[PDB]
């Protein structure tokens, strides 16, 4: 009856592990685009549409 609770505690953390791992890789992927494109062109994508 506590193995049921603990399977149900464990998989609800493995879903958190998966989601967290995928943010670690997506931030690493984003950084590579932002350091292979020109920082003036990446600035025009992200910031020149919003600048006072």
């Amino acid at each position: 009856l506590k193995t049921d609770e603990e399977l149900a505690r464990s998989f609800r953390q493995i879903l958190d592990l998966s989601f967290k791992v995928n943010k670690e890789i997506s931030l690493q992927s984003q950084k590579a685009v932002e350091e292979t494109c020109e920082s003036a062109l990446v600035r025009q994508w992200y910031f020149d549409g919003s600048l006072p």
Partner: peptide, 12 residues
């Protein structure tokens, strides 16, 4: 944060 503040003169 530091990469882009240094290009905006303002914290992103």
């Amino acid at each position: 944060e530091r990469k882009w503040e240094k290009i905006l003169g303002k914290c992103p």
